[PDB]
């Protein structure tokens, strides 16, 4: 189907003009078109694939999007304003308002290279500000990485740059918004035993402990270090090697939740079965090392950054900084009159 139907130039429901592709997936495409009722406006239309997975994520998506944007209808807390929905040859379609790049895609365009950190201020804020909103009205996100998180707008200036030798792009404006309430999961629905982009996955979905609001802090938390190093921080497709590298960033995992997992297979005697002499022990003990020398600089402003990373990389969903909490620490401290 879908490639038939997602062609440049094609006409959706009478009304939006493909112009070009954003963005694709497992749950389908992304596509540009212009809007003819609205005047030529640009939109974001996602057309979902028609298998029953991504048709309920796409009914879900919209509950939930109905829900947030009449609480928040001048997008205050920077969730992406849904626009419509219907349906196209048998594809369920919902339109968007139109964004810039995913903080991925920039990442990626410009070599893999970090932000600078009063962007990542800002992005941070405004990322903990818009889930914390999520958390008041009883959801979790449960799938935040940098793919979710778009830009408002990635126009841009370019300049040499001695430090990397090379031409580059600095954001004009680095201001965001969340997007993907697919996996979004209210706190009395039914939650799944896998959530999670691997990458950002918190160790108490892999352990299967259960989750709620803290898995997306963990998240966050995944997100800020990459932004501020530009790779991915659990480059890893398996479980255990994502677990050796917590241990080897973040230290050992409390034995209260070892001793309580249901996938005893990770694990001897209360201790991560782990032989480091191996190969893959190698890697993990070479792409891996302790938090804190990840930093670039000694610097306040960084280390302000990384004592927040570190609190919201806390292994124990109870004792994991909440993200009200979070708003509140020194790191944000230059965005406000003080
Ligand atoms: N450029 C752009 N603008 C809006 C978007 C909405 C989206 C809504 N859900 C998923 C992905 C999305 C990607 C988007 N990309």
Not at 319 to 325: A, G, N, V
Request: aromatic fraction near 10%.
């Amino acid at each position: 189907s879908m490639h038939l139907i997602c062609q440049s130039g094609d006409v959706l429901s009478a009304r939006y003009e493909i112009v070009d592709t954003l963005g694709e997936g497992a749950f389908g495409k992304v596509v540009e078109c212009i809007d003819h009722k609205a005047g030529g406006r640009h939109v974001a239309v996602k057309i979902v694939k028609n298998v029953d997975r991504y048709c309920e994520a796409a009914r879900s998506e919209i509950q939930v999007l109905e829900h947030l944007n009449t609480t928040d209808p001048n997008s205050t807390f920077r969730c992406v304003q849904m626009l419509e929905w219907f349906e196209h040859h048998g594809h369920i379609c919902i339109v968007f308002e139109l964004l810039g790049l995913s903080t991925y895609d920039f990442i990626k365009e410009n070599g893999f290279l970090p932000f600078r950190l009063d962007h990542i201020r800002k992005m941070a804020y405004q990322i903990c500000k818009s889930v914390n909103f999520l958390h008041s009205n009883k959801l979790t996100h449960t799938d935040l990485k940098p793919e979710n998180i778009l830009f408002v707008q990635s126009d841009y200036t370019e300049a040499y740059n001695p430090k990397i030798k090379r031409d580059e792009r600095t954001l004009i404006n680095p201001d965001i918004k969340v997007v993907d309430f697919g996996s979004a999961t209210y706190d009395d629905e039914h939650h799944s035993t896998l959530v999670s982009t691997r990458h950002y996955r918190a160790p108490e979905v892999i352990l299967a402990l259960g989750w709620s609001q803290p898995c997306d802090v963990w998240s966050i938390g995944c997100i800020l270090i990459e932004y501020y190093l530009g790779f991915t921080v659990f480059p890893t497709h398996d479980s255990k090697e994502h677990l050796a590298m917590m241990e080897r960033i973040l230290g050992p995992l409390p034995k209260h939740m070892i001793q309580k997992t249901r996938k005893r297979k990770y694990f001897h005697h209360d201790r991560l079965d782990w032989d480091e002499h191996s190969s893959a022990g190698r890697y993990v003990s070479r792409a891996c090392k302790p938090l804190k020398e990840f930093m670039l600089s000694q610097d306040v402003e960084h280390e302000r950054l990384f004592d927040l990373i570190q609190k919201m990389l806390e292994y124990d969903p109870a004792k994991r900084i909440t993200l009200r909490e979070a708003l509140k620490h020194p790191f944000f401290d230059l965005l406000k009159k003080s």
